[PDB]
Amino acid sequence: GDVEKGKKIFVQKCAQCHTVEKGGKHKEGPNLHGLFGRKTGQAAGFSYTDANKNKGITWGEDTLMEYLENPKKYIPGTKMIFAGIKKKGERADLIAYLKKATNE
Numbered sequence: 523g524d525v526e527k528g529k530k531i532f533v534q535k536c537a538q539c540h541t542v543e544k545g546g547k548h549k550e551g552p553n554l555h556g557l558f559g560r561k562t563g564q565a566a567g568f569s570y571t572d573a574n575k576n577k578g579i580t581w582g583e584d585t586l587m588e589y590l591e592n593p594k595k596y597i598p599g600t601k602m603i604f605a606g607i608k609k610k611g612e613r614a615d616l617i618a619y620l621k622k623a624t625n626e
């Protein structure tokens with residue numbers, strides 16, 4: 523995916539609730555640094571719902587593609603309030619951004 527486009531998508535749709543950098547603050551949602559290859563509900567120091575803690579999947583390209591299409595369908599009872607991104611390209615770009623930004 524296109525990392526620059528993904529950043530713009532992140533800023534538009536995600537950044538008000540999430541930081542990405544190492545040591546970034548939790549906000550309404552958790553800081554996302556280190557997400558890739560991590561199980562659900564494992565950012566330190568954040569009160570997740572039991573639903574997000576209990577989902578039990580490993581975050582990566584395949585599971586983010588599904589989740590981001592419709593978060594509440596993938597994790598029913600999540601307190602993340604975001605309807606989803608319908609477009610496959612847009613999700614791929616966003617994921618490519620996340621794979622860089624969350625690992626820097």
Ligand code: HEC
Pocket residue numbers: 532535536537538539540550551552557561562563564565569570571573574575590599600601602603604
């Ligand atoms: C606030 C209004 C949010 C917006 C907009 C987005 N997210 Fe979010 N996210 C938010 C909360 C409160 C939580 C925790 C949910 C729970 O039920 O405890 C989350 C969680 C996620 C996660 C899972 C993190 C993990 O398992 O460690 C991911 C991967 C995630 N959020 C990503 C994400 C992206 C990419 C968004 C824009 C498309 C986005 N979120 C929007 C709150 C909010």
